Amino acid sequence: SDEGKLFVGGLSFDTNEQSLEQVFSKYGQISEVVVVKDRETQRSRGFGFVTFENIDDAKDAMMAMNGKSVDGRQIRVDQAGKS
Numbered sequence: 001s002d003e004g005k006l007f008v009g010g011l012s013f014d015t016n017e018q019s020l021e022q023v024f025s026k027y028g029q030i031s032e033v034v035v036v037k038d039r040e041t042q043r044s045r046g047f048g049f050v051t052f053e054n055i056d057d058a059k060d061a062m063m064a065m066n067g068k069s070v071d072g073r074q075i076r077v078d079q080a081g082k083s
């Protein structure tokens with residue numbers, strides 16, 4: 001629902017909020033970054049969300065990062081959908 005929020009998928013098992021912030025901050029100011037984890041075990045589900053303060057920056061980041069390699073894995077970047 002938030003057009004400034006990007007889904008980032010296909011993460012390596014050890015990719016964390018630090019690597020996402022460093023990568024995506026090139027495109028503008030970031031308000032929230034999260035790697036989604038199992039609640040009980042805290043194991044990464046291999047995707048996350050990056051929210052930009054400015055929606056145009058999210059669009060820029062999607063075009064620039066979708067398909068690019070992070071920690072050896074080609075990531076998928078899309079506007080975050082509902083859920």
Ligand code: NI
Binds near residue numbers: 013
């Ligand atoms: Ni790694």
